[PDB]
Design a binder for this molecule. Structure first.
Ligand SMILES: NC(=O)C1=CN([C@@H]2O[C@H](COP(=O)(O)OP(=O)(O)OC[C@H]3O[C@@H](n4cnc5c(N)ncnc54)[C@H](O)[C@@H]3O)[C@@H](O)[C@H]2O)C=CC1
Ligand SMILES: NC(=O)C1=CN([C@@H]2O[C@H](COP(=O)(O)OP(=O)(O)OC[C@H]3O[C@@H](n4cnc5c(N)ncnc54)[C@H](O)[C@@H]3O)[C@@H](O)[C@H]2O)C=CC1
Ligand SMILES: N[C@@H](Cc1ccccc1)C(=O)O
Ligand SMILES: N[C@@H](Cc1ccccc1)C(=O)O
Ligand SMILES: [K+]
Ligand SMILES: [K+]
Ligand SMILES: [K+]
Ligand SMILES: [K+]
Ligand code: NA
Ligand code: NA
Lengths: 349, 348
């Protein structure tokens, strides 16, 4: 309900409703402790407004931890645009109006929130926001931004994956079966990187053309209905979050979970179940941080493309630290990553 | 209602929950067309969060219209702090924390919203907010603000009442019976002004002592349960809003409605009923603007106290304009005041 969604502990919630387009807007700032809150804009259809608020809150909390654990001097926030219809069907006029409105909202926060792309938003959209507000990462190269962060995210997830498989004792990825759920911007790149390292890929996507392309490349399609029941060495969720529910955690047939999606774990019990079953999960907020490293590194810290690459690869080392903590203290990898995030943040202050 | 809580059409809603004190915070910015949004901080207990969101939006929209119609260069907003218990029951430490959090919220808006006092907040509270954020009107004179704006609001309401009584054909307040609902900062002052003008005062308040005092000052008390059906020439709502529902509009026994309360009319329908029954209503957002005039005038425009008083007196002329549109166009006073506000704002 709205009441439960409003019982959230973050720093601020910004909302707006635009009767003309019928769109609802949410900006959640989980924390501004390390710096202004930063996070992308997701646009999707939600069943109830409450869902958009809850997703924004979980996404914003993930950004706070992602920044902290990755030694990025930013807080965490997220924007969710609850669409009046499927993205597909939204006309250009309506989408342009929605973006102008979102930009006005960001603008009022005057630098306390910096946006970027997320699901259903791109660099062209970031250039549009930027026509109205300064606080946007991810603009096109021509507009002064760093462009797509997808590739860097993939590199980071792939390095997360290699470090995870290694710590789990499976050796290298050559020969291992990897199931990639979601062949999007990040997923498609991750599939190619894993393939080049010798993995056998199993893939799934609601978009049939994407699947056909992967199959043309030698991969094996998996029916959507069987994704969570398919045996594999590594399950790589690269679509939406909330995939690993307590029920799915009890029956997942794999040894490692390492993907790009945000908020992979639907509930705490699910995290405790994977840990107890010996399935090594590389925490989402650590593993998928290459996108933030690329945007913040490039646009805020002035790092070179080379250095961003290096920091993304370093996600493997961060995870080795997380696993180290998990093994020594007897806690799940998610809890150990939160601990590490806290240590890093403190150090960074 | 759900629609007023969630499907509100204003520019921005800010919410926050603080588990430690149990308080919910709402800031609604209805419009920043004419300048930064400005409006006070109301702190009260609400049955449901939807009621706090609904009220914040209605109060913020009233602020936009008040600024527009009063020729003040600001937009409209409002803050509502939904308390975990009665204001009087909150401890000092809890209150202090609630104010600090509210100031951090205002601060993130960086000048797009300017607050001030409202129900349950005062100048000392503004000073506390100002220890953390710059965007505060109504700080004490010692801290650099304009102090209390209540007397100015009373003067504006009194002039609004004079203009309304005259337009209604009653001549002057001399020899009229005025029922003041709410003997607070504004109400007590209004009553004193009206009595001085020769009106006989009927008064009501939930505070037993306030009534006894008015009674001592020569007035006549009305029991709470009789307030809404007590015959009077003028009904002056100076307590809470939402007083005039359709049913109340059908049974009020008076010829003029002119008071200080914000959002007096509960439903559009009530406005038509008053009009049809020959009860002339002075729109709240025009009538009670003296406080805004005082704070914006003093604090943003540098006006002195005498100029502010004069501008508050001019609310009577603004209402004469509203009545002229009402009579000429055949619309209620509220619709007419909305039309005048849009004209003065050079397009809604
Ligand atoms: N792009 C980036 O830099 C970063 C993205 N992430 C997260 O990674 C995830 C993927 O992001 P992107 O690749 O950029 O998004 P995207 O929009 O390019 O691709 C998502 C892909 O998932 C597919 N998909 C959707 N629902 C599916 C389902 N039920 N089963 C299978 N496939 C399905 C979509 O058709 C699409 O191919 C999202 O959670 C995103 O928030 C996290 C960190 C950084
Ligand atoms: N103070 C100002 O400058 C301005 C105030 N207003 C509005 O004027 C109204 C009164 O404001 P203030 O005098 O400042 O507040 P106040 O808190 O000083 O006084 C309100 C009075 O109403 C009495 N009361 C409460 N509920 C009652 C009820 N049901 N029946 C009878 N009496 C009741 C209280 O006992 C108190 O004496 C509010 O709606 C306020 O928002 C609007 C414009 C400016
Ligand atoms: N949306 C991406 C990348 C991003 C990082 C920082 C700011 C904006 C966008 C993520 O979930 O990490
Ligand atoms: N709270 C008052 C006055 C106020 C005006 C402007 C800013 C802040 C407070 C009202 O209802 O008008
Ligand atoms: K995208
Ligand atoms: K940019
Ligand atoms: K007050
Ligand atoms: K008279
Ligand atoms: Na508006
Ligand atoms: Na009297």
């Amino acid at each position: 309900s709205i009441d439960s969604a409003l019982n959230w502990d973050g720093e601020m919630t910004v909302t707006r409703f635009d009767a003309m387009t019928g769109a609802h807007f949410v900006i959640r700032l989980d924390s501004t402790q390390l710096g202004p809150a930063a996070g992308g804009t997701r646009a999707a259809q939600y069943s109830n407004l409450a869902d958009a608020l809850t997703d924004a809150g979980k996404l914003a909390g993930a950004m706070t931890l992602k920044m902290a654990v990755s030694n990025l001097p930013m807080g965490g926030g997220k924007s969710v645009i609850a669409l009046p219809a499927p993205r597909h069907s939204i006309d250009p006029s309506t989408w342009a109006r929605i973006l102008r409105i979102h930009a006005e909202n960001i603008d009022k926060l005057s630098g306390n929130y910096w946006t970027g792309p997320d699901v259903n938003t791109n660099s062209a959209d970031m250039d549009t926001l930027n026509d109205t507000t300064e606080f946007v990462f991810g603009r096109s190269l021509e507009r002064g931004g760093a462009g797509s962060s997808a590739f860097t995210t993939a590199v980071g997830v792939f390095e997360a994956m290699k470090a995870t498989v290694a710590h789990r004792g499976l050796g290298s990825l050559d020969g291992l079966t990897v199931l990639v759920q979601g062949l999007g911007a990040v997923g498609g790149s991750l599939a190619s990187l894993a393939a080049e390292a010798g993995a056998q890929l199993l893939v799934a996507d609601t978009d049939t053309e994407r699947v056909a392309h992967a199959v043309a490349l030698g991969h094996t399609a998996v029916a959507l209905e069987d994704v969570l029941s398919t045996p594999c060495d590594v399950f790589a969720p690269c679509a939406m979050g909330g995939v690993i529910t307590t029920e799915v955690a009890r029956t997942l047939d794999c040894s490692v979970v390492a993907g790009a999606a945000n908020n992979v774990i639907a509930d705490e019990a699910a995290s405790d179940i994977l840990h107890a079953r010996g399935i090594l999960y590389a925490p989402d907020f650590v593993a998928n941080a290459g996108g933030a490293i690329h945007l913040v590194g490039r646009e805020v810290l002035g790092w070179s493309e080379s250095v961003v690459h290096e920091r993304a690869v370093a996600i493997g080392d961060t995870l080795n630290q997380v696993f180290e903590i998990s093994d020594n203290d007897g806690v799940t990898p998610d809890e150990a990553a939160r601990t590490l995030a806290g240590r890093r943040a403190r150090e960074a202050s």
